[model samples]
Each structure stands twice: as structure tokens, then as C-alpha cells.
Target: NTNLIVNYLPQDMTDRELYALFRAIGPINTCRIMRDYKTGYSFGYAFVDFTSEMDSQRAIKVLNGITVRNKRLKVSYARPESIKDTNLYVTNLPRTITDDQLDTIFGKYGSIVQKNILRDKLTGRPRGVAFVRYNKREEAQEAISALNNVPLSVRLA
Candidate 1:
């Protein structure tokens, strides 16, 4: 049920390329790069479903932060859509914030399944948006209430 979320992909990459790339890490059940519904252009991200949790974890450890085609990859577990209620969509984050900061802040409320900060595909810079998946819906709601409108600094929203 868990899958790997891959980011910073080249726009011109194909499904076959993606499969081949990830398959080297593990046996993938499915691999898909999200595309615009109307135009069919890649959204510069993908999901890779592996057969085992350990394999996925191994892939994440090996592939994440690696440069490919001049872009640093961000690979983490994909949260299931059915758990949207437990997944917090956050914005207006400080560009300097790292994954440890996010974990430290959000982990105070509840257990986190995954945390991902959206970033520039080419430069691996923060985009001020992120998805944080908590173990429970109530925890996610609490995070939203606590984090929304909290100013990072005078200059950054």
C-alpha cells in the first residue's frame, strides 16, 4: 500500500526511464509520473510502488539527494490518498527549514509517517510548501491549527 514519491525529475523523462531507474533499487510494482490532465506534460514528480517496505526504504536511502540530470532527487514514501484527512498540506514555510526542523515541530503533536517539503526541481531549493503525514487525523488537524498563519520571520511569510 505504500509507495515512493520521487521528485526533481527531468521534464522530458519517460515511464520506461523511470521504471528502469527505480528497478535498479528494487522490484517496482508500478511507476508513474504525474501529468497534467489536459496537456499531458509531466509535473516533475513520480510515484514508485515497490513490492516490499524494506526495498522502498533502501531505495529512499540510496536515491534521495542524489543528483540526476543536474537535479537532486527527493525520494520518500507516498501517502495514500485515502489518508488525506491525516495528511497535512502546509505552505508558507521558511526556505531555510530542513526536514529535521519539520520533524521536530510536527513530531510534538503525534507520530509522523512521512514529511516532504516541495522544492525547485533543478536547484533543490525549498518552494515553501510541504506535505506532512501524521499517524492520526486529529494530530494533522492540530498541526494545521498550530502552523497556519505562524510567521517564520519578518521578511518570510
Candidate 2:
């Protein structure tokens, strides 16, 4: 199954609009426009499933980076969501922080399946955000409780 992640979408864009935009390339299996949970408005992103991989690649090749309604879309192959909800999304990290340091901080709780420090695509600079996936949910919960609101070497406040 070929799924695409379309980012930088217009907040007011609808599922139909999204489908139509991608349908020009090929047949679609599903199209989802994510929205805010509380406000129920578009979250400026979408997930589209294409019937074939070729159609998906063609959509990316033709549509990626194209501006639509003042928004430049970033289109790429979407990765499957983790089966276990053991991942933690972290932000406001120190720019000086390294992968080993991050791994050390979380390793106290449990075995880490994966640890990623997000970086800018163009500049290759850290985005001060990290994603840590643990082998167990309990470890992630404990890390959230222990790390949330805790002061770091550098203060974002």
C-alpha cells in the first residue's frame, strides 16, 4: 500500500479538495485531512492512500513543493504508525543535546526501541524536538511524568 503525507496544507481545505488534488495523479484508496481534536479545524496536513505505488510516486513528483492557496506542500511516503503506543514526543530540548545524551536520559526508565532528534531538512539543524520509543508503555509514562516541566541546562522560558 502506498500512502503519502502531505504537509503545509491550507487550514480550511476539506477532504474533498485534498482528494481532488491528488486524484489528478491516480486512483485513491483513502484520503484523510487531519484536524484539531478540540477545535475540529484542519491541522494543515493530510494522509492519502493511493491504489498503486506508481500513482503515489507520480503524485509526489508532480505535486511536491507546489504552492496551493499560499501553502507549499511537502509530500512524501508516509510511514506506518507504530503498533505499540510507546513513543513519546518531546520538545524544547537543549540545542546542545546529543543522541547519546537523550538516550542516556531515557535509558534509566527502560529499553529504547528507537530515539530520534528531529532536524531541519534544508539546514540540517536540530529542531529541538525528539521522539523516543520505548519497549514498554510504562517506561514512556514514567519518562513523561519525570521529564515534563523539568528544567534543562538551557531554559526555553
Candidate 3:
């Protein structure tokens, strides 16, 4: 099974239009174009499931990074763990990192569950924190391995 994301679409595009776009490539197993409940308009994102990985890759190679409906559509393969929203249990953090910094770092790995930097309430800064999460285990592992005791490049001076 191949899962891909089609992002930044026209709010006016309908489910039928989305299905047709995928259909032009080949048979689609299933497709969903999310809509805002109150506005009854596209949420600018959708997911398409292809019967074969080849088809999905083909679509990405051909369709991704293309303009659709005056929007530069962003398309790419979505990770398996990403399909189900997850929570992650995080541990082993840098002492100086802030909550926002932790969130930014963890966000790169996968969706975060929850993060706490174990900081002094008065200081409002990390006290050498750890996190609790149910995020993609691989991503969590990557984060731990990649950033442990290593200052992030983004903030490197």
C-alpha cells in the first residue's frame, strides 16, 4: 500500500475533481479530500491510495511539485506511522532547550505526543527535560540518536 499527500489545493476543488485527477493516472483504491465542516470547502489537502506502490510513485514523480488551481501543490509519500496520529514518550533532553525548541526538533521526526522540558517553574526554562509520547517509534529513535547531547544545527553558533 502506498500513501501520499497532495497539499495546497484549491479550496473550491471538489471530491469529484480530486478523484478524477487521480483516476487519470490509473485506478484508485480509495481517495479522501477533506472539507471544512462549517465552510463546506476544501481544506487544501487530500490523500489518495493507490493499489500499487508503482502507481503512487509514478504519481509523485509526475504530479508532485506541480501547480494545480493556482496553487503550487506539494506531494510526497507519507510515512506509515504518520497515517495514525500518534503520541510519543520522549526522554533524554538538552538542559538549555526550551519547549518550543523541543517541539520543533520532535516535529521533524514525526507527530509529537507531548513534551515536557522539566524546567524550573520560576525560571520557565528546561531543567534537563524528557517527553512522553506515542509517536512513530522510528522517528523517536532517530531524534534520540541524532540530537542527544548534540546541540541542534539550527541554533549552533
Best by lDDT: 2
lDDT of 1 by residue, 43-112 (tens): 9999999998888888888888888788788989876432567767777788887999888888988898
lDDT for residue 114 in candidate 2, whole number 0-100: 81
Deviation from native of the Cα of residue 71 in model 1, angstroms = 1.4
Position 92, candidate 3: lDDT: 51
Report how far off residue 28 is in candidate 3 (Å): 0.7
Candidate 2 runs further than 4 Å off: 80-157
Please count the clashing residue pairs in each candidate, in the order shown.
0, 0, 10
- Let me know the TM-score candidate 3 reaches against the reference structure: 0.49
lDDT of 2 at 110: 88
lDDT of 2: 0.82
Please, what are the lDDT tens digits per residue for candidate 2 over residues 13-99? 899999999999999999999998899888789999999999998999999999989989988988632425687787888777788
What is the Å distance of residue 97 in model 3 from its true position? 39
Ranking by lDDT: 2, 1, 3
The root-mean-square deviation over C-alpha atoms between each candidate and the true structure, in angstroms, is 9.2, 9.6, 10.8
